[PDB]
């Protein structure tokens, strides 16, 4: 179920693309590991950097309560 797969061409430096980005967060808000995103080193780093910008902007959350 690797996330990089379930998407087309997309931008890792694109911090406003909330719809793409939010898929890389666990349901608890955490940036997901490489085992679940399927990114390389290089890409995964830009992923993290832009998710981080995004939360600053209001677009992505910093944390989410876990439901059952």
């Amino acid at each position: 179920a690797k996330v990089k797969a379930t998407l087309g061409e997309f931008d890792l430096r694109d911090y406003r693309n909330v719809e793409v980005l939010k898929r890389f967060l666990s349901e608890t808000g955490k940036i997901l590991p490489r085992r679940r995103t399927g990114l390389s080193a290089k890409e995964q780093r830009i992923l993290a950097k832009t998710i981080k910008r995004a939360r600053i902007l209001g677009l992505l959350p910093f944390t989410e309560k876990l439901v059952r």
């Binding site: 309560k65 439901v67 059952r68």
Partner: protein, 114 residues
């Protein structure tokens, strides 16, 4: 008297405290290992959390409480058992959400935690 509400479970390694609140968040009643009768470390146990959540839900029902939302904070040994008891209480439990507080590396912990 209120129909739906909230149940918070504070579960630490030492105890379980359960307080039932109104929809806006204000407590109607609360209970804990101590209230149900234990002192010391026994308060920390799963049987302690059970009696606590029951007594908390029992007290809530006599105020008309019927459905509750369950909020869980802690990783104590009384945690999961505390939830069991709320379900088996006669209360609805529309949800169970864990809102345990964790820092994004904040204040330096006490020494026991390093």
């Amino acid at each position: 008297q209120v129909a739906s509400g909230r149940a918070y479970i504070h579960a630490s390694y030492n105890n379980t405290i359960v307080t039932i609140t109104d929809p806006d968040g204000n407590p109607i009643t609360w209970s804990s290992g101590g209230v149900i009768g234990y002192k010391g470390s026994r308060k920390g146990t799963p049987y302690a959390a059970q009696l606590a959540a029951l007594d908390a839900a029992k007290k809530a029902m006599a105020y008309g409480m019927q459905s509750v939302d369950v909020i869980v904070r802690g990783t104590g040994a009384g945690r999961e058992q505390a939830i069991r008891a709320l379900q088996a209480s006669g209360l609805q439990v529309k949800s169970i959400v864990d809102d345990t507080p964790v820092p994004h590396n904040g204040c330096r912990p006490k020494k026991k935690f390093r």
